[PDB]
Symmetry: D2
Subunit: 240 residues, 4 copies
């Protein structure tokens, strides 16, 4: 049985990814930063289905002198639990506005660029160095119609498109595929967003995102590398 | 009942693999073909041996002309006549040959290249929608932005198909119809291409230094028509082994 | 010694502005038109009063048909016949109207795909066969967030991006550059109520206004200039940031 | 009163070409430089000899650090200190080297590649906007960012982030009348270290003329974007690549 690392797996999209990979037959490393209770609750549910198939791993993914070691630790944890590491899902993300005109700004850089781009880079290095192997990066379908005042966030998501493509090229000789899934929209403010989605009749779910990840790690995607699949209900096609 | 799909240019290569994989999934299929009647009929025989009454053939030229609308309406009508429903449309048929800018008539080249690649998909899409997990899949080209030299009209047609995929995804979403694309890089090489040229192409692909099988292309089509893609519309999935990422 | 340019759909609006600015820059111009004969002639008369023997008109339907190749060959030949050379081609003419998925549809195809794509393709072939040479295609900045029910128009504009790129690649060895200018919202329809024009104007980040024809023309003048000698295959958005705005 | 521009990494090569052409157009210029002090001063002397009191130098490391925000505020402040205004910012300075995924610390590489290429442009854009007519920012991008060189992941990440900044800042700064655009070279001046044969390998790939862009040709696109002939253009990235990005493998 193969093994997968999912970053930010305690909640929301990462949790759904971890569940679906587990349902597919993977052993999973559930990475978390602050959500230890939720991480361990998930691992408890998964291990009750199949014993010793889920572990947790704590790491802050903010950029800092120690982030490379932290990322090597996450990958190492998968090898120590399971003896292998077939899949890496870069799901963890920080998200908040950083206006250009008026935490320090450099802490924002560390958290937005670090979590969203540099940690994926370092995880990707550690994953490859230790080697159907495939990395999936959680991108953003709205990368080229960005939210107002989200410059740093958007820079980091752009940088992650760059990583996806550069790592796809560079790791292809090692048989490692590298792809992305780009959610769009995944309560008055929540309804405003839902009514703009062309496929709005359906509610967006974490499960839907997870379905795309499962496709890309599967044997049905064996020739796919460097691809980013939008899972956005058509929202990125909608003009202002 | 079992859902039903139309696959254009289904007698051979990628279209044939799509038809087979849809039929293995549970769909009843219309095997559209233009010249390859023996292959189309042999495929329908094979599929019907596995399940009776689950495949039919439909012949049509998809070159643009004043009767193309009627031809495309007839292909969708053929699926309703055989199966009583039409759930999936795969726009696979394509003309492909060079049209140099500097030295068949050029109008015939337009009709064939733009017709098969773009206008026939558009008209099929209109007829599919009008006749109503509904979904259209367009076979695009991952190398559309790094085109082969002297293939202007082909490239124009494949860009127009990207436009149709996006415009139809937007317009048809209220009707429950998803519209997506699959973009091969190099898959099955042309029957006419020489051995040495085939190898040159295969050596460029980062992922394995080989072309995609037809079945690998079909696998992406399968995903996009499946319930695991219910929130995906307007997306074009490259299935190219990294080839579009490789600089000159 | 003065260079010459063909501008399609040049009687009015953006094409007229382009023609004027090329003339101001020193080009002799072919003013192509379809229905707008009085406006095309008034422009040519205006430009020839500024400098004699610097403007002609050429009428043609750019709808696709059996005869479109010969029409496009004629348009290019008209520049050589008047001016002895053809340095610049600007593919500006365009049909634009909705074609809902749910005039015959084949006439719509001929018009929308012809004007926006096939005529540019044929003009490009005739331009190159007859040879700072450069083609500029008028594209659409909103081609990836299209208007609802405009599929044929959007198909046509996407095909023109493909032509721009394919032609840039193939014509580079002949020294011919091929680029695009992609407006967002520029001159609004004639009949459109101010209330409706203002809904579009308020979307534009940059000044909450549409581009003037002149501002589109300025990008065309840049691309044909010596300041753009290394630029080919590029499409310059002239959209005030409109394509960057989410739903 | 003549307008004023800041050009990062302006002592040599493309940055020098941009500073020169902005000066020739009538701008007063801040020539930012990190290590090329003798080249920066030689350039400022040449410009000042053409028109007195129209060029100054400004030294800064654009590596990311906790002081980078102050450094970037000081670069902008230097233009107001010399000239009393700052109309144009050209983000040109760039670190460029390979960072292979499979085997300077990697943190230092991050700080240098992502700092120069992305974070410093972001901090400079914040400081330019805060200190505020034809105001505009031009970011030096990379036409090949989608067909990247092997083993240049961090560089490519930084250039992709710069695309994002160009678009996000165009959107946010448009209400203030500040336009934000890019110029994306393909191959222009080849690296100083590169041998002739390897330079020719790159040259032979370019459709338009089988040669690299001159520095002047890159600067031409920057001058257009900062001109009144680009007054409606914001969020646009102009490729200046001779067709290179269109060439398949
Ligand atoms: N929701 C959407 O609509 C949407 C749209 C576009 C893109 N996406 C992308 O899809 C992925 C998942 O989205 P989501 O909404 O599920 O994400 P989310 O809940 O915003 O964040 C997922 C997890 O990231 C982890 N994380 C945040 N900062 C961290 C740090 N400094 N160190 C380590 N881990 C950290 C957190 O884990 P702990 O709770 O353990 O601390 C958090 O629960 C993300 O990459 C996101 O950018 C989502
Ligand atoms: N193979 C590749 O590497 C590759 C690369 C990029 C994109 N693609 C795209 O993927 C799809 C499948 O590729 P493929 O190589 O399998 O295609 P193909 O063998 O070139 O063509 C598929 C079929 O199209 C039909 N077709 C051609 N002209 C037609 C016309 N005028 N009217 C009706 N049908 C016509 C033919 O049917 P009959 O045989 O019945 O006459 C032909 O067998 C195509 O859309 C293609 O553009 C393929
Ligand atoms: N205005 C905008 O906001 C905007 C937005 C995006 C893209 N664009 C593009 O920018 C260009 C200029 O826009 P515009 O608004 O100035 O264009 P326009 O007024 O819509 O059309 C320009 C001219 O095209 C000619 N034309 C139409 N159908 C023709 C046919 N069948 N045969 C030959 N010529 C035909 C007409 O010439 P006659 O009058 O002589 O018949 C017309 O005056 C076009 O390519 C357009 O698609 C404009
Ligand atoms: N040349 C090309 O073909 C090409 C291709 C694609 C993109 N570009 C882009 O176009 C721009 C100009 O290219 P170029 O070749 O002229 O650039 P370059 O010579 O590689 O670099 C320009 C300047 O960047 C400065 N720089 C480097 N690290 C720095 C740091 N840590 N702090 C502050 N400044 C630093 C250096 O200043 P000092 O010398 O003063 O230390 C250097 O002279 C760059 O943004 C580049 O990425 C160029
Ligand atoms: O058979 C094809 C082919 O191999 C290739 C192909 C071969 C080499 C390189 C490439 O980018 C495509 O393109 C096709 C496009 C359309 C079509 O209908 C068939 C082919
Ligand atoms: O006049 C036009 C127009 O205002 C617009 C337009 C109006 C509102 C929003 C928009 O994105 C474009 O588009 C056109 C496209 C082609 C053409 O030939 C003319 C127009
Ligand atoms: O000098 C450079 C260069 O020639 C090239 C270059 C050389 C060959 C191919 C290519 O696509 C770029 O890229 C650079 C990118 C950043 C930078 O700061 C300088 C260079």
């Amino acid at each position: 049985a193969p093994a997968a690392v999912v970053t930010g797996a305690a909640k929301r999209i990462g949790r759904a990814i971890a569940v679906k990979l587990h349902q597919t037959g993977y052993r999973v490393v559930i990475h978390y930063h602050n959500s230890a209770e939720a991480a361990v609750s998930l691992a408890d549910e998964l291990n009750k289905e199949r014993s010793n198939t889920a572990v947790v791993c704590q790491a802050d993914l903010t950029n800092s002198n120690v982030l490379p070691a932290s990322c090597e630790e996450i990958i190492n944890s998968c090898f120590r639990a399971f003896g292998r590491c077939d899949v890496l899902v870069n799901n963890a993300s920080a998200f908040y506005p950083t206006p250009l005109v008026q935490k320090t700004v450099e802490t924002q850089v560390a958290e937005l660029i670090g979590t969203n781009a540099i940690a994926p880079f370092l995880l990707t290095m550690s994953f490859a160095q230790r080697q159907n192997l495939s990395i999936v990066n959680l991108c953003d379908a709205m990368v080229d119609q960005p939210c107002m005042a989200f410059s740093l966030y958007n820079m980091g998501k752009h940088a992650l498109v760059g990583l996806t493509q550069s790592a796809a090229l560079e790791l292809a000789p090692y048989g490692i595929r590298v792809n992305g899934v780009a959610p769009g929209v995944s309560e008055e403010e929540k309804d405003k967003w839902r009514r703009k989605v062309p496929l709005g009749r359906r509610e967006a779910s974490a499960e839907q995102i997870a379905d795309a990840v499962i496709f890309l790690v599967s044997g049905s995607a064996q020739y796919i590398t460097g691809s980013i699949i939008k899972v956005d209900g058509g929202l990125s096609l909608v003009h202002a």
